[PDB]
Symmetry: C5
Subunit: 268 residues, 5 copies
């Protein structure tokens, strides 16, 4: 794409969208927002995580307003994503230490719940085309379930970087977070942002405000250009683990808010 002039009163639009988490349990059922209880393999050889027990990436394509093209010009207008605000919603719910939680003083049947604790994985991506993925796994001999999208028998090389093992995030709730990450060799037309804090007893730390704005412009002053007039949102928002009295543990996820400002860009 040959990028040309920015248009400056009717040249800018705003979209707002949410992505619900895909932590593994089905929508419209009692554990929506959570994974199912996590089972652990005895070895890498026999490792087979069941469907529902691991999170997947969230994705959506947002259809943009009419650009009102110039019928006789040899150029076209494209929506250019210039800025965003993103917030993890429902942080407030993590003040719940009463709902069926392993207690601080289990031996005394006393104390609050321990609440949600452990690993936070927070990433979002805003592009003019689907997020480009690198396949990479902890254990290449893991047998993923039929419901999941992965590279089957990916080989030892998939435990680190293999340039043959590529993907694109083309479907919501089926690309396992533990098997796909953003590809830094691609995503020329996406901005991605990721933070990981590991562990299983780590205090979760989350902020929320409606006062924060991230500029989406690259080093040439060009934001994502929305090919076929779509805006591609991707995320994963693991808050940590929910622990039952019987010590079963499940992933807990939260939904993400996006506001994206776009402006009209002349191209070609």
């Amino acid at each position: 794409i040959e990028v040309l002039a920015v248009r400056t009163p009717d040249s800018i639009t705003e979209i707002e969208a949410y992505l619900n988490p895909r932590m593994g349990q089905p929508q419209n059922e009692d554990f929506y927002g959570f994974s199912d209880n996590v089972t652990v393999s005895d070895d890498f050889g026999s490792d087979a995580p069941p469907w529902k027990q691991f999170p997947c990436y969230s994705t959506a394509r947002i259809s943009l307003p009419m650009l009102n093209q110039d019928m006789t010009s040899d150029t076209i207008l494209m929506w250019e994503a210039i800025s965003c605000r993103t917030e993890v919603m429902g942080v407030n719910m993590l003040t719940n230490v009463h709902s069926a939680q392993k207690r601080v003083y289990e031996n005394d049947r006393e104390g609050t719940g321990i609440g949600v604790e452990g690993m936070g994985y927070h990433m979002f991506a805003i592009g003019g085309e689907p997020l480009e993925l690198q396949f990479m796994v902890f254990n290449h001999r893991a047998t993923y379930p039929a419901e999941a999208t992965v590279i089957k028998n990916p080989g030892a090389s998939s435990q680190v970087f293999d340039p043959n093992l590529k993907g694109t995030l083309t479907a919501d709730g089926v690309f396992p977070v533990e098997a796909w990450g953003p590809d830094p060799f691609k995503n020329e037309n996406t901005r991605y942002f990721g933070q990981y804090t590991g562990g299983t007893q780590t205090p979760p730390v989350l902020t929320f405000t409606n006062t924060q704005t991230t500029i989406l412009l690259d080093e040439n002053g060009v934001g994502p250009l929305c090919k076929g007039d779509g805006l591609f949102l991707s995320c994963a928002d693991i808050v940590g683990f929910f622990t039952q009295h019987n010590k079963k543990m499940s992933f807990r996820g939260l939904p993400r808010y996006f506001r994206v400002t776009l402006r009209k860009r002349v191209v070609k």
Copy 2:
């Protein structure tokens, strides 16, 4: 609201406090605390009793009476009474309980610190850890909110219109609304987490949006909201209660012409 020129007599300043609503009744010996937290066995038999969970604090501040509206341009906010957390002697589980020795363990665990300042009530998203929780009659909640309530459901909206009754654990700020409010929030989780608090009279936050417009005080009302969970108070017998702290606000407003 169409926003015209800043009027430049033109400036006012209010100070206010919101006391915390951790659950125990005001004017009684456990004011500032929740009652002792009980935990359900399962999501299906989950009814957190009244007094055992915190609620948002809120207040409408009356301001002096094309039109002029009061426009909020800056604030200072301070969590008050941080000093009281140096108390490790008041009926606290001890560091070496099995020796009946050491300090009290003092206040530890989750911090949830949020404030909002706007020209109308805080717009809220309903969201809960367990949709099947039965909240007490005293609480304001969406009843039988459905499985969708565990994540984002665009039907499940509310506005913060009463002090001490909107459970923190069931409402948060709606990012899809609040064009006329600035909100700020931090959560640190856990039950033995060290609390981290700062205080100073030297910090101003600017409340102007990208367009240089502050919150515009509809009907000459300034809306303040907070929640300041500091962590938990643990008794000798291991019973745990939320402890909260009051919040100071100073807001600077200017006359702005509109319509």
Copy 3:
């Protein structure tokens, strides 16, 4: 006070001062810098913290040089504080893990002392008049000893904010840290800065440098104005707890350094 012009030539001065901590144990006896061993009540109603077992605020008024007043002027000169350096001194001493401390591996009588750990409370205030206080307590039914300055029988409202419960920090070593904090409704003529990190096994975190200057000027470019030609300094520097082999714990505090640059200001 009506505030007029700055003098910029004679017109500048610096004072340096220390405040020693008032953690509870008497001065120039063997436990100076410490509290006595902390006792814990069984309930709120029978809560009576003995004198010496809890810290108090440090404060001093510093006498300033003669201003050399213009005898015939309608106006008057005051000293205006414009900047400070402050440092917690003796941080070096906390590398001591041999001095009668509970050992890391007590069941094996082995390892270092555990050293000082637990809550940090670090605050300082620089003003032209005494620090204005808000009375607030964890437990209102606490009976403070006669040695201590408190509001007696303050009632339930004292557990949160009650606008009736005020004070000024008019004496060193007697205002319990746990019952008084800075009053954000007053202190127009004082700058105060406070940090708390809780717990009883929290690692203390402290920094020291002679390269850090804090400006004391308000939004109007006016510093604290020294009424009756006094500078008021206040602090509390709880570093954490000292734990003995028998598991007795005391507060440990450190002294604070102040450097304050003042300049002549004309006022009505």
Copy 4:
């Protein structure tokens, strides 16, 4: 090298490269990305860390397109595969081992993240926890380094000239050299520390020095070096191995006239 004027497309090139980690286990086999299970010696005197049980630096030379030299002016770098650390099912010691319940504990313990970009091999200082350690034949070390190798000895020098054979625990960047290399490094210690990693394609680091000069690529060669220890993998039987991640590099060079 006398450094004259910047030549201003055809004057700018951009390379991209990955460095796979060298945690110890062989390439293209089932434990690629890990060390073998760590053994611990009884004393300094008889301390022989076996080949495969310790990490080594990753390094590559990239071949690039009055003389003209390539001058590295900026980079992006990213630790890849951070996403795999959300795996708590793969043969991991469980949170509640006694009850055979909970997630795996996942990767925890020490983080060591370092990268270097230079016009020549990274210049190294030899320094070791225990000088009496006997390294295996596969490792490049200074043999019989002496007690002074446990701190700084100006005699104990090297350059990173070989991928996967310079042990991290024996070699670090030499601050007395590396005039023509930029290095960055962070260590967080412990064995139960939570790993903290970030990733984004939006961060650029400028490689120009105080004089506006970046690494100048000798022999038309760009030198990349790293080590990315994420933490430890703990089996059900409490055996612990290093886990590493590959690092991405993007480097932007310009033609520089030199003498």
Copy 5:
């Protein structure tokens, strides 16, 4: 000490300070203290020589009058790489199972450096005033109860390497007009060490007036302590582990009265 204009003219020195954690140099525990013993009370407290760290220090010789003025510095904790060692005679993560890595180096961090035109000026201050320091150590003997906090009588200067106990001396903020000092402390005995290294960080040494330290007698004074944490043996004996510090200083010629 009146300063005129900045006046061939710019020079740069590099130095290293090895750590003085207690164990004698060029012997097998160089970089470590000896195993720490703990007193039963303040009254009998007598830390043995080799069981506590001392400050490192050196004077570097440099090449109306002219003085060398220190304008900027680079400093680096060297050898952070060695802390990836979890095999060398360390208490194991799962000692009851004789399994896991070593726990490695853990506990308190104390990192301080000073760059000045004269010896670093010290304030004497001790946890316990009744501690008896050994003959080898430079201390104020019988310093009294006020030495547990600030006493203005209890001053010193860092005149010697490896003999001023870290736990007895810190920088005096009432003096050091011609030194820049920087310190960080993180306590605990199981705290994770956090260390960074780059050749890309330069600290400016100019004061508010734009004057850096002026090197009296053409001597540059370098001081540091870098306690990274503790080494714990299988038998639970614990010793300080320290690391050496790199210093790059840029000096320019300043005219003085």
